[PDB]
UniProtKB/Swiss-Prot annotation, chain A:
This is Transcriptional activator protein LasR. GO terms for biological process: positive regulation of DNA-templated transcription; quorum sensing; regulation of DNA-templated transcription; regulation of elastin catabolic process; regulation of gene expression. The lineage of its organism: Bacteria, Pseudomonadati, Pseudomonadota, Gammaproteobacteria, Pseudomonadales. Belongs to the autoinducer-regulated transcriptional regulatory protein family. LasR in strain PA103 is not active, this is probably due to the change in position 180 of the sequence. Transcriptional activator of elastase structural gene (LasB). Binds to the PAI autoinducer.
Amino acid sequence: GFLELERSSGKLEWSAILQKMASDLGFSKILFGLLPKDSQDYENAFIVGNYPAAWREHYDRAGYARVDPTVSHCTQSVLPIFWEPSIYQTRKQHEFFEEASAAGLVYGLTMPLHGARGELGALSLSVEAENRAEANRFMESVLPTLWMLKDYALQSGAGLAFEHP
Amino acid sequence: GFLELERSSGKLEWSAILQKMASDLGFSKILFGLLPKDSQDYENAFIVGNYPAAWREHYDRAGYARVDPTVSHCTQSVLPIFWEPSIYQTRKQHEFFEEASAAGLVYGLTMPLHGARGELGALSLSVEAENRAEANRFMESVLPTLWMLKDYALQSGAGLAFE
Ligand SMILES: COCOc1c(Br)cc(Br)cc1CNC(=O)c1ccccc1[N+](=O)[O-]
Ligand SMILES: COCOc1c(Br)cc(Br)cc1CNC(=O)c1ccccc1[N+](=O)[O-]
């Protein structure tokens, strides 16, 4: 199923395919973000997915890239960070989690992306669940496949974002 | 289970755990290699595994880092490169295949490693098999586990190697 990502032509089809693959793994909302090597801001970012517009706008306007604990995590690790007030510490981080929750994004994980040419990014995925224990069971159940998916998305996504005409 | 690598005491236990994980998965030979960001040579390389000494020595002496097709692959991709006839394009690369085979290393794959701090490496694993069909069937059954393994190995190995 992974070959479909490479086979696709255009940001639209590629995003639709990734969203569908994520949905099949139990995740209703995803965000794929990728920056060029040594990017100093977000001007040149490639960001696609189905997170709600209002949340995307608010995150930007509130400067949450400097608050969201997953951002710094991604600069330090190749391993996923699960969304837990716990990775929250500060007042603004409590605010961030409260607002994410209100936006419907409560349980999930962020998988760091580190490309062969120094690309830096993240594949973030939200899972709908009754509670955290259930969310954790849903996520653990698909983790091996998601682990493959994130690398296929990185390899094909970097090409689509930064290379292919 | 994968966190056992990070929770190892040092280089010796980390190496033993990694080799044991690979073996339990069915790979009798593994090599983990890692370079610091923007390395010009192999002077600061962290290289661990149970590839035979004779093959390790020959690879170095022959300058096979400039021939081995997996090397350039790792600079270009995060996806695994399987050891298949198609990856050996030139006679020099074909000779590499024959020499690795003579050393007992015929079937396998190489997983590129790209760390959060610019580390560059590879995790290579060989499986003992009678033919390519048996090797493929086996590798397909363990591939998702191996895929998680390589990132856990990278994160822990990087912390061990460069701090
Ligand atoms: C990692 O780099 C930052 O990437 C972005 C960008 Br850019 C915009 C937005 Br919006 C969100 C993220 C990633 N964070 C999350 O998905 C996240 C993580 C924990 C908890 C709740 C959320 N969430 O957003 O619901
Ligand atoms: C990628 O960076 C280079 O890493 C090294 C270093 Br350093 C030393 C040695 Br020895 C081997 C490798 C990796 N290659 C392989 O395992 C390999 C790949 C295809 C076929 C046969 C082999 N093999 O060696 O049997």
